[PDB]
Design an enzyme around this catalytic site. Structure first.
Site, PDB file in Angstrom:
ATOM      1  N   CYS A  44      59.104  59.188 134.954  1.00  0.00           N
ATOM      2  CA  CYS A  44      58.338  59.394 133.728  1.00  0.00           C
ATOM      3  C   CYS A  44      56.975  60.002 134.059  1.00  0.00           C
ATOM      4  O   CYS A  44      56.244  59.480 134.903  1.00  0.00           O
ATOM      5  CB  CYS A  44      58.137  58.079 132.979  1.00  0.00           C
TER       6      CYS A  44
ATOM      7  N   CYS B 158      54.307  60.416 131.906  1.00  0.00           N
ATOM      8  CA  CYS B 158      53.182  59.885 131.150  1.00  0.00           C
ATOM      9  C   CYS B 158      52.750  58.493 131.605  1.00  0.00           C
ATOM     10  O   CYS B 158      52.413  57.640 130.786  1.00  0.00           O
ATOM     11  CB  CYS B 158      53.528  59.877 129.661  1.00  0.00           C
TER      12      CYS B 158
ATOM     13  N   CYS C 206      63.650  58.855 134.101  1.00  0.00           N
ATOM     14  CA  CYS C 206      64.159  59.237 132.787  1.00  0.00           C
ATOM     15  C   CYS C 206      65.668  59.467 132.732  1.00  0.00           C
ATOM     16  O   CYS C 206      66.216  60.186 133.566  1.00  0.00           O
ATOM     17  CB  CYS C 206      63.441  60.498 132.310  1.00  0.00           C
TER      18      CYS C 206
ATOM     19  N   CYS D 244      64.342  56.103 131.074  1.00  0.00           N
ATOM     20  CA  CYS D 244      63.918  54.807 131.593  1.00  0.00           C
ATOM     21  C   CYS D 244      64.603  53.613 130.939  1.00  0.00           C
ATOM     22  O   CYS D 244      65.283  53.758 129.923  1.00  0.00           O
ATOM     23  CB  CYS D 244      62.409  54.678 131.428  1.00  0.00           C
TER      24      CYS D 244
ATOM     25  N   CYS E  11      60.481  55.124 123.774  1.00  0.00           N
ATOM     26  CA  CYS E  11      60.064  56.257 124.590  1.00  0.00           C
ATOM     27  C   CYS E  11      58.567  56.481 124.450  1.00  0.00           C
ATOM     28  O   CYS E  11      58.088  57.086 123.487  1.00  0.00           O
ATOM     29  CB  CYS E  11      60.824  57.519 124.179  1.00  0.00           C
TER      30      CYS E  11
HETATM   31  C1  LIG Z   1      52.664  63.793 127.402  1.00  0.00           C
HETATM   32  C2  LIG Z   1      52.689  62.558 127.855  1.00  0.00           C
HETATM   33  C3  LIG Z   1      52.578  61.603 126.682  1.00  0.00           C
HETATM   34  O1  LIG Z   1      52.561  60.375 126.683  1.00  0.00           O
HETATM   35  N1  LIG Z   1      52.491  62.431 125.502  1.00  0.00           N
HETATM   36  C4  LIG Z   1      52.372  61.929 124.076  1.00  0.00           C
HETATM   37  C5  LIG Z   1      50.992  62.117 123.538  1.00  0.00           C
HETATM   38  C6  LIG Z   1      52.541  63.793 125.898  1.00  0.00           C
HETATM   39  O2  LIG Z   1      52.490  64.726 125.142  1.00  0.00           O
HETATM   40  S1  SF4 Z   2      62.714  58.082 128.050  1.00  0.00           S
HETATM   41 FE1  SF4 Z   2      60.730  58.730 127.418  1.00  0.00          FE
HETATM   42  S2  SF4 Z   2      59.248  57.124 128.147  1.00  0.00           S
HETATM   43 FE2  SF4 Z   2      61.232  57.000 129.374  1.00  0.00          FE
HETATM   44  S3  SF4 Z   2      60.813  58.307 131.165  1.00  0.00           S
HETATM   45 FE3  SF4 Z   2      61.950  59.555 129.655  1.00  0.00          FE
HETATM   46  S4  SF4 Z   2      60.212  60.570 128.606  1.00  0.00           S
HETATM   47 FE4  SF4 Z   2      59.241  58.810 129.728  1.00  0.00          FE
END
Ligand SMILES: *C1=CC(=O)N(CC)C1=O
Ligand code: SF4
Lengths: 73, 109
Positions: free
Chosen positions: B49, B51, B68, B70, B79
């Site tokens: 992931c 983020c 992912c 996850c 998500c």
């Molecule tokens: C990239 C990572 C994340 O969490 N987001 C949502 C605002 C993105 O666009």
């Molecule tokens: S399902 Fe969503 S929160 Fe999980 S790793 Fe993939 S993009 Fe990130």
């Protein structure tokens, strides 16, 4: 909270991978199972899983939880 | 790798369709996550992931909880990245397919 402990889901936890409810919302609250693992790290290295408590229920079904979502039976 | 991006793009579209989820109405968000996933797959070998902040990305990939899709997505359809959204999510659009150009508009920056 250790592997082997018997726990009950004491919070609302809605999953979509339940065998008899695949792909559909199902609340596990009330179900009882046994802690299979506590994902705090990998081979000594700290990991950041936010649902570290892996619990195994019958029907070859298991799910992850936060410590606060389950209670020792 | 462009083939990695296209692969990740394909994965996202197919997973969305399979789970009856949709991309953000603002595909720029979708594009950012997909590219991030692709980058992690290229560097770590797995689509960790993008983020999240990690203390040990290599250990995270080995554990697989955040690869992912996850655990929270597979089990609770949660998500954090806003890649796969349920129909009732205020930020979900009607697309389950994204333009390759949109993804590349992110690659350049
Ligand atoms: C990239 C990572 C994340 O969490 N987001 C949502 C605002 C993105 O666009
Ligand atoms: S399902 Fe969503 S929160 Fe999980 S790793 Fe993939 S993009 Fe990130």
């Amino acid at each position: 909270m250790n592997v082997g402990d018997r726990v009950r889901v004491t919070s609302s936890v809605v999953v979509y991978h339940h065998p008899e409810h695949k792909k559909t919302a199902f609340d596990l609250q009330g179900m009882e199972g046994e802690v299979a693992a506590v994902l705090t790290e990998w081979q000594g290295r700290p990991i950041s899983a936010n649902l570290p408590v892996l619990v195994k229920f019958e029907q070859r079904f298991k799910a992850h939880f936060r410590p606060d979502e389950v209670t020792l039976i | 790798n462009n083939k990695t991006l296209a692969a990740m793009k394909n994965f996202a579209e197919q997973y969305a369709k399979r789970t009856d989820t949709y991309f953000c109405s603002d595909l720029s968000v979708t594009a950012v996550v997909i590219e991030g996933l692709a980058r992690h797959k290229e560097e770590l070998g797995s689509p960790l992931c993008p983020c999240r902040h990690y203390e040990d990305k290599e250990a995270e990939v080995k554990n697989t909880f955040w690869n992912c899709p996850c655990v929270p997505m597979r089990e609770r359809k949660e998500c954090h990245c806003m890649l796969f959204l349920t129909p009732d999510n205020d930020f979900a659009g009607d697309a389950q397919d994204i333009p390759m150009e949109t993804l590349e508009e992110v690659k350049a920056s």
